[PDB]
Amino acid sequence: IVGGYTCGANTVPYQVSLNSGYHFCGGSLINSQWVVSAAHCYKSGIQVRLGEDNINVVEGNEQFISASKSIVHPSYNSNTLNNDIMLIKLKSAASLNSRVASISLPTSCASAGTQCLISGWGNTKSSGTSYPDVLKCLKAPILSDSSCKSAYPGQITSNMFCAGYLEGGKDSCQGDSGGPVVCSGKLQGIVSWGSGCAQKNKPGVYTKVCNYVSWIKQTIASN
């Protein structure tokens, strides 16, 4: 996250770190057994880390649970990042508490102008590289589809939305991928892509979670 703020330990209790020997992606806990992340974060041997603040220090509220199963959206296109969404099942249920908690799926899509909360452990510089150890947060508005499509001509599908700041300076970035965009207490977005981070006229592009609820519910009901 570029140009954000320190969330505060476990103030984002649905935030998870995907770990494959190292943090590589975020995710969102949607119930005690299932995490939503980005399909582009797919890899084998995922360990899900819940209750994280400092990802480099065991602080005492973590739960580390291996993934049993990863399910990439059947129409995920790695070239266009259309349908950049995947589900990860935990080998054992998380214990939900004040520090580890699920985020609601949306019943309806969020409106342009809505301010959302984006979070993760990704790069904090638009040019440099500097990874934080503690969870960073950003408040960012959903942009109109017209401004989104104008920012990324020929590249925005109906399964994507833009959020952020056209002036630049504030954005999600590498290592935030898969993480949550929460608006009005519902998971509306997944950190997906963007051209660099926090660049002028290049806002973040997010998977549009409300298009996937039916798939998520059906998948969870069968796996």
Where does this chain bind Ca ion (CB under 5 A)?
Answer: 52, 54, 59
Q: Taking the complex as a whole, how short is the minimal distance between the CB of residue 114 and Ca ion, in angstroms?
A: 31
59 annotated among ligand-binding-site residues: no
Nearest to 36 by CA among 14, 7, 11: 14
Asked whether residue 177 is marked as a ligand-binding residue, the answer is: yes
Q: Which residue has tokens 């998520």?
A: 216
Decide if 73 is catalytic.
Answer: no
Annotation-wise, does 174 bind a ligand? yes
| Burial of 167 (C-beta count, 10 Å sphere; 0-12/13-18/19+) | exposed
CB atoms near residue 162 (< 10 Å):
26
66: its two tokens: 């291996």
- 133 catalytic per annotation: no
- d(CA 61, CA 170) in angstroms, rounded, equals 29
To the question of whether residue 52 is assigned a binding role by annotation, the answer is yes
Which residue among 37, 40, 73, 192 is the active-site one? Answer: 40
Residue 92's Cβ-side half-sphere holds a number of Cα atoms within 13 Å equal to: 7
Annotation-wise, does 176 bind a ligand?
no
Our CB check for Ca ion shows the closer of 51 and 204 to be: 51
Q: Which is nearer to Ca ion, 54 or 80 (CB)?
A: 54
Toward Ca ion, which CB reaches closer, 29 or 86? 29
Q: Evaluate whether 146 touches 195 at the Cβ level (below 8 Å).
A: no
Is 40 part of the annotated catalytic residue set? yes
Q: Which of 17, 84, 119, 176 is catalytic?
A: 84
Residue written as token pair 């969020």:
110
Residue 40 beta carbon to Ca ion: minimum distance, rounded to whole angstroms: 25
Which residues carry a binding-site annotation?
A: 52, 54, 57, 62, 171-172, 174-175, 177
Instruction: Show which residues are catalytic.
Output: 40, 84, 177
Which residues carry a binding-site annotation for Ca(2+)?
A: 52, 54, 57, 62
Which residues carry a binding-site annotation for substrate?
A: 171-172, 174-175, 177
